[PDB]
Subunit: 269 residues, 3 copies
């Protein structure tokens, strides 16, 4: 169980994550409205949300997404797209652990995700902080589904501590680093990380523990099935580093469960 307020935020940023997949939302002119196709992001359309920055084929690994200004909810939203291109999938396969001493000592992160973020950090950091200067009353939120959630998590860890809080909402995100990084993500201040999983989705189980990967805490686990609407009672908070009993169970994983986080996600053309 989560509060209705937190449920509304989980639902909203799942739609911001879904919107990042739509092709027209990766080269949109600044100041234009954020829209999706196939009812992918109704709540985002209802809001007075526009593009501050729209990017695709950026850095290494085909970083893609947009930076949004939400005047209704008073948000600065950085939404990363998940895997769609061949270049995205190849970056996922770069799963050896690389030192990220510039984030925390003893921490190691997925080579692919960390390399991709490093390659766009300077540009996007400047875009976000320009927005905070213009709208200092707003709230900064990084979000993304799958690979996009892994990027939103790494980015949040790297840019926190510079005067503005950064909340992160990831959906079906894979493990991003070793246990040192997982513990750091669990105790870091300057914003909250909401790591949302769904039933037996396979992606949050990758890369496997045996390669040295761990999950941060807590986990918000959606128990309602695929194609089933989600209510605030279907989400379970699960505390503990590499906690079992949520998505991390010793049962058969599922691929279609990876595409149902409050609605269909990853399928917007």
């Amino acid at each position: 169980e989560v509060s209705q307020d937190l449920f509304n935020q989980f639902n909203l940023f799942a739609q911001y994550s879904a919107a990042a997949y739509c092709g027209k939302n990766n080269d949109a002119p600044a100041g234009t409205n954020i829209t999706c196709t196939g009812n992918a992001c109704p709540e985002v359309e209802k809001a007075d949300a526009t593009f501050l920055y729209s990017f695709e084929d950026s850095g290494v690994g085909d970083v893609t997404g947009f930076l949004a200004l939400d005047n209704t909810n008073k948000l600065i939203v950085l939404s990363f797209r998940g895997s769609r291109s061949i270049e995205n999938w190849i970056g996922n396969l770069n799963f050896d652990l690389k030192e990220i001493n510039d984030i925390c000592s003893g921490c190691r992160g997925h080579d692919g995700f960390t390399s991709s973020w490093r390659s766009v950090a300077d540009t996007l950091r400047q875009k976000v902080e320009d927005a905070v200067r213009e709208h200092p009353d707003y709230r900064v939120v990084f979000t993304g589904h799958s690979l996009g959630g892994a990027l939103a998590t790494v980015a949040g860890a790297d840019l926190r501590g510079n005067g503005y809080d950064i909340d992160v909402f990831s959906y079906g995100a894979p493990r991003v680093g070793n246990r040192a990084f997982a513990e750091f993500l669990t105790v870091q201040t300057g914003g909250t990380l909401y790591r949302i999983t769904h039933t037996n989705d396979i992606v949050p189980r990758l890369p496997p523990r045996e390669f040295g990967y761990s999950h941060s805490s807590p986990e918000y686990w959606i128990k309602s099935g695929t194609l089933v609407p989600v209510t605030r009672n279907d989400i379970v908070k699960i505390e503990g580093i590499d906690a079992t009993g949520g998505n991390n169970q010793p049962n058969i994983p599922d691929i279609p469960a990876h595409l149902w986080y409050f609605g269909l996600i990853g399928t917007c053309l």
Copy 2:
């Protein structure tokens, strides 16, 4: 077992479905020969078959194929290509059920398949009906492998009942809609649906029943193995909505079985 006459049709249109994958057959000039690479479609090449309309990157979902005029067999063949592009695959994943009451009452169909067809139906109907007018003694046949088989099925159900029969030959096609639609496809008049499957091919088992999908009846189940020539005694007719004992068995599915329908299907460059 099936008759030799039906076996000959099953083999012929399996090769028309293969020709649709060949890139050269998706942007060819009208009136030119239909040819394939290797021995992908020797029976089509032997016929006096020419392009009426060759299309690619059409509508939504990257609809690809050709409309052919076969003077040897007296056919008007609309052949849809199966999955190859990333865009084809994103469309396959839009597996929510959408209303198609214009086709039949209470029927619901795969969102992607029905949205792809709807985006090209006006253009293709006109070309099919132009050919029927000029060649009223020719037989209209929609066909396709995998996704293409799903598009042929939908297009056939949508255009039937306008004066001319439309027969559909689908190979390794997934489920396309709900039970209402599966029953409509079973009893619809004005043409016959030949839904063909091969051993334990995985694709006719998608999307899973649990998501609300059913299969029309009957099923023509190829029992011979992969890379094994098919004889008319290897094909078994299986009647009953969502019938088991054919491809729909609770065993381990197979991927290479998806590519062997009389010959190799889906591999023409």
Copy 3:
């Protein structure tokens, strides 16, 4: 166990194979250095290795790779990229056996691999033999990982016997032909084939024996695990056509093992 000299050769050409995946190494000016990204080919970078010819999207099947001049080791290295593009994967799925009598009598090879090589054989033979004339004391070596190893295996069998030795180092290569071709690859004069496999990598088990495919002898089998450094004591030579007890064992296969051949291979962007 293998000798430290052979181990060093196995390690060097694993990095030449890894280099072929980097996009910048498929369209580089002749004479420029060969480099990779993130420690993918450190030994290649240390060497005085420059491009003689880089190719991409060549022939049929998206043949990709480079021809390198290594002055440090006195090598002419032809490195084929493995699977990355959709076109690559379609070619892999063309797995029926085709006559390659011009290479060896009674031999039959994978249709995709042999068609891909035939479509570039005249261009690449000219490039290799030009380099031989220019540096007649250098050693010619074909190498590749996965699909690249299969192309390197077929190319060496075709181009041997024209006045110079061709050594082949394949990593995680699939079976390329029938038994006759497997025997020929075992005994052919004018160079050596080092076929290297890793633990229970699935790819060297494809296509299955039951489709008529056989593996040449010997097999150099890496017993250390994924993400585990390799030492010369972890490699075991296994002789015999279609020998078991190495990679060819009736146990569960593994996909990540395919990417670890002394290091991460297939992941360079």
